[PDB]
Amino acid sequence: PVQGSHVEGGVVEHPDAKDFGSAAALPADPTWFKHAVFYEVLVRAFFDASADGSGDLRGLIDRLDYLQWLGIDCIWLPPFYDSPLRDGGYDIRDFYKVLPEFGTVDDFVALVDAAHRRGIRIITDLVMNHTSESHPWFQESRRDPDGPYGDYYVWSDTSERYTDARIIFVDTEESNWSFDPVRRQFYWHRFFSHQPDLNYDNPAVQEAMIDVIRFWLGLGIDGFRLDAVPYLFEREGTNCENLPETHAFLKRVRKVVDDEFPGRVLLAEANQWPGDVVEYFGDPNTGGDECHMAFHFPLMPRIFMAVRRESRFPISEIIAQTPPIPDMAQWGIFLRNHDELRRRLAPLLDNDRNQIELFTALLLSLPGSPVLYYGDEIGMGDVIWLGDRDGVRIPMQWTPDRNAGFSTANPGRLYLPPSQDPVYGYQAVNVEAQRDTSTSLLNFTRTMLAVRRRHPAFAVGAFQELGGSNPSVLAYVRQVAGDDGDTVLCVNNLSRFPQPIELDLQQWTNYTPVELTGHVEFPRIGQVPYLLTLPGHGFYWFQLTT
């Protein structure tokens, strides 16, 4: 049957892309990811259509109207592949099957179709470095070492190999080698003991993984974030991170992608400083020949520090300090600082809406492609009772009714109960209560999104941080090269109190600032310091017109 992967007799058989119906493709656009606003949404958390207490693919399809209305450009889904779920689905049991709980592969095709028909793209995580103990390849590797899958994983008779390579999960794991009961040998894992690393020295492993990519792209997905890529290859006498063999493989994966499925995106999961992470964009001379995107991690904690210090410098510095990137490349940016490795936006700022709105303005005007996390648009919170990764993974708060309008199933059959937090709970903050109030958090972010879309300068423009006498105020221009090109001005007050600013806008003398929210013309720029004034944590967006 099409659904599932089956082992017989000694070879692991998987369905090809042809076996399923092909969803409608979207017109080829090489640099769509530059202009895209991403929406990361957990399938299990969004909407439950089958009425079993856990959100599913069919449930997501229903809520595409909402997402399109909100105005997001691409949906980003955490892993949904078949798994025993010992590590939240990052322990993949089968690359060729959707977790039965979330639906079938046919349901995924129906998602990719419905979303495409609304002009919304889909990308997912794809764990690269490791699989689950439960994966058939590993079950074959440990049983028949002389079989075709015997060299799929890293095997050793000793534990005294690849020293100096750090142990990632220091709290749980004590070594990167684990003694397998059946095969009676040690195996490699940078993560959990139930997550054995693939042996990327094996050419069959490379191809098998390129085939996994080929599969999902054939179904119609618009790209992947490639997970745990800094740990792909390992060589004796090193720290086993960021190796030349790792980069070379990713370059090859790009070459395949560009050839067979042109116009898709590849993002690199790498929790590291920019300038270290910049390697994953590849060679600058090619215009980028590795991953299209990597994330800018220090941005958000710098924004936070700027607000607490009431000073622009922490923000202006990391931007000035950010390495230049190739043409066919973009920084992924988001209002968080932890990956794997959390809190959520609203509770981090003590529920201060002006401050949230400021952070959101920043997110949507700074260089890069913004990523919103499901429920940030309504100021949802986290839960401590669950701790870190499970605490942010609570069901979407649509209404103040039973189950927050997320499921019709009996409360108790739910995977997690919606938070009844006195401030961030579903009775206090939800979609229904905010859809009609014009100044709600929900309608605010929809407005900015709409405004951002009419101005390419936010997405692909240059960045010029201006200077003011006032250290509390961050002002900058985003400009598209060429005469009569999109030019926007962004003024942000990091102080909790009203502030005056003088800006040197001589560069745009005789231009007229037109405020983007209400199209009100402001005094034209002269040869004189341009004076603006803002309340605590306010911001202005202007188009500079000629």
Q: Which amino acids are annotated catalytic? A: 227, 269
- Residues in 74-133 at the binding interface with Ca ion, rule: CB under 5 A: 129
- Residues in 226-265 at the binding interface with a second copy, rule: CB under 8 A: none
**Least CB distance from residue 249 to Ca ion, whole Å?**
11
Closest alpha carbon to 506 in 492, 524, 522, 494:
524
Three-class DSSP labels, 180-235: CCCCCCEEECCCCCCCCEECCCCHHHHHHHHHHHHHHHHHCCCEEEEECHHHCCCC
- Residue 269 touching Ca ion (CB under 5 A): no
- Residue 100 touching a second copy (CB under 8 A): no
Choice between 91 and 382, CB closer to Ca ion: 91
For residue 9, whether the previous peptide bond is cis, meaning omega lies within 30 degrees of 0, is yes
Choice between 231 and 304, CB closer to Ca ion: 231
* Nearest residue (beta carbon) to Ca ion: 197
Give the contacts of 429 (CB within 8 A, at least 6 positions apart). Answer: 346, 378, 379, 380, 381, 397, 423
Choice between 197 and 486, CB closer to Ca ion: 197
- Residue 420 touching a second copy (CB under 8 A): yes
Report strand pairing: 223-227 vs 121-127.
Answer: parallel
- Residues in 263-322 at the binding interface with a second copy, rule: CB under 8 A: none
The β-bridge partners of 316 are: none
Tell me, residue by residue from 323 to 362, as one string, x for binding to a second copy by CB under 8 A and - for no binding: ---------------------------xxxxxx-------
Tell me, residue by residue from 214 to 253, as one string, x for binding to Ca ion by CB under 5 A and - for no binding: -----------------x----------------------
Q: How far apart are CA 332 and CA 267, in angstroms?
A: 8
Q: Which of 21, 100, 485, 498 binds a second copy (CB under 8 A)?
A: 498
Stretch that binds a second copy, among 207-215, 334-342, 381-389, 452-460 (CB under 8 A): 381-389
**Least CB distance from residue 60 to a second copy, whole Å?**
21
What DSSP string describes 463-515? Answer: EEE--BS-TTEEEEEEE-SSTT--EEEEEEE-SSS-EEEEE--GGGTT-EEEE
Number of residues that bind Ca ion (CB under 5 A): 3
Looking at this protein, which amino acid is placed at residue 528? V
Closest alpha carbon to 168 in 90, 228, 225:
228
Stretch that binds a second copy, among 14-22, 95-103, 211-219, 492-500 (CB under 8 A): 492-500
- Residues in 143-162 at the binding interface with a second copy, rule: CB under 8 A: 159
State the first-to-last Cα distance of the chain, in angstroms, to the nearest integer: 63
Closest alpha carbon to 396 in 373, 423, 363, 422:
373
Estimate the crossing angle of helix 353-365 against helix 299-309, to 10 degrees: 130
Choice between 231 and 398, CB closer to Ca ion: 231
**Least CB distance from residue 172 to a second copy, whole Å?**
8
CB distance 225 to 268 below 8 Å: yes
Would you state the structure tokens that stand for residue 285, as one six-digit string? 């001379």
Name the binder of 400 from a second copy, Ca ion, none, CB < 5-8 A by kind. Answer: a second copy
**Least CB distance from residue 120 to a second copy, whole Å?**
28
- Residue 495 touching a second copy (CB under 8 A): yes
Q: How far apart are CA 457 and CA 468, in angstroms?
A: 22
Q: Which of 56, 91, 197, 376 binds Ca ion (CB under 5 A)?
A: 197
What's 285's DSSP letter? Answer: G
Tell me, residue by residue from 499 to 518, as one string, x for binding to a second copy by CB under 8 A and - for no binding: xx--------------x-xx
Choice between 23 and 165, CB closer to Ca ion: 165
- Residue 520 touching a second copy (CB under 8 A): yes
- Residue 433 touching a second copy (CB under 8 A): yes
At 123, is the secondary structure helix, strand, or coil? strand
**Least CB distance from residue 121 to Ca ion, whole Å?**
29
Name the binder of 124 from Ca ion, a second copy, none, CB < 5-8 A by kind. Answer: none
Would you state the structure tokens that stand for residue 428, as one six-digit string? 């206090």
**Least CB distance from residue 178 to a second copy, whole Å?**
8
Q: Which of 83, 538, 543, 544 binds a second copy (CB under 8 A)?
A: 538
Q: Which residues bind Ca ion (CB under 5 A)?
A: 129, 197, 231
